[model samples]
Target: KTHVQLSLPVLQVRDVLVRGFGDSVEEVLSEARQHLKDGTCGLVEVEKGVLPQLEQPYVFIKRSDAAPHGHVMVELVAELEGIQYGRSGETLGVLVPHVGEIPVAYRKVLLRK
Candidate 1:
């Protein structure tokens, strides 16, 4: 197997915030950026078997008037660099549902927000 380090768009997880169903990915990212914007913070639509924990640092998304009950809204915090390190296989990561263990700098912001 050829393990080549493909030069790709490496976006580091940066911010995690809560939003409603009506809010689009851009909106969520904007909100996250409003608090702190260094790079591009985007949202990824994810389907889960169960919802995430509702806490101060967590976002409790309810079903919108045009949406269903079994739906959940979650965003991510990241950067546009080479690569980053964080808690793997959690609600949050490079591509996860929520924010997990990351750098102290971003972790503090992500945990508080």
Candidate 2:
């Protein structure tokens, strides 16, 4: 007998933070891409400021039922590294995978107050 493999449409949300650290923006983006590929999820530090007011902010990938009709589903390729808060005080960041597109409304909500 022969067996067949199927690739299902799976969506995962990954959190990542790309710290400049004297690195170029492109380098930061490159790092984010690598981290996404390597399954490295970044951390977010609360207590210092609100989610949107961090030196390095988190890129949120979330699923919403409110996604407009005909909206494409988002599939996150990065693994979940879990979220941390309070301890110190610095918000991490994240990146999107595959889809390469995020809802404008969602971005406004997360990126802004």
Candidate 3:
């Protein structure tokens, strides 16, 4: 059997760092963006999809300054390998599967406020 791994993003706030959301959902993303600060910051990969499935983490490096030129190009990147669509898709990078082992995961996206 292969080893399963799990990880969650810890948003750094000022000097406080948090991860592993508790029973209740919290909005720390806005805080994460604040920590990014003129530097490069990529959305730390959580688990594949929401739960059960696990996808490779999307890690990109880009810390640039946008003063006179406000940059809105936080490009999404991955060490992408293999046939993006070969596994399952009509096009590359479509309907892809996690290339790594992952533990049981589940999360529901809440749009109700």
Candidate 4:
């Protein structure tokens, strides 16, 4: 006899936060790997100027909308060069997202008035 188990399509999420990296590309990606593993994870792409457009497959930062601090600046920037998913009960490297471990990150809210 054989055993087969099917996983659900929807992913469980919570406490998800947006973040990015600085100079330590490897280290930043490593952290992103962890976030992907966490039930709560998300990513945001920013293109304020012509720089981000050229840095695809890399990390970028978006400005906060609510003035959470005071002004706006490049709060977070992550450079994701690649992604590799993990199998059931498996582990992945320090950086990059496991095959199916990446969560979508989107910002901006549209208020209809």
* The candidate that achieves the highest lDDT relative to the unseen native structure: 4
Tens digits of lDDT, candidate 1, 1-113: 11111111212233334222223444433454343233332232234522241111222212222212332222343322223222222343222232332323222112222
What candidate 4 gets wrong by more than 4 Å, as runs, is 1-23, 49-113
Task: State the C-alpha lDDT per candidate.
Answer: 0.27, 0.29, 0.22, 0.30
Error of 4 at 37 (Å): 0.7
Write model 3 residue lDDT over 4-111, tens digit each, in one string.
111222221221122212221122222222323322221322334421232322122222212123222221122233211112111111111222323133211111
Per-residue lDDT for 1-113 in model 4, tens only? Answer: 12111111221122112223223556564554444335233333322442232323343333323322222222323434554222121111012222354444333221111
Count clashing residue pairs per candidate.
9, 9, 7, 7
TM for every model, in the order presented, reads: 0.22, 0.28, 0.20, 0.28
Which model is ahead, 3 or 4, in terms of lDDT? 4
Candidate 3, 57: how far from true, in Å? 18
Candidate 2 structure lDDT: 0.29
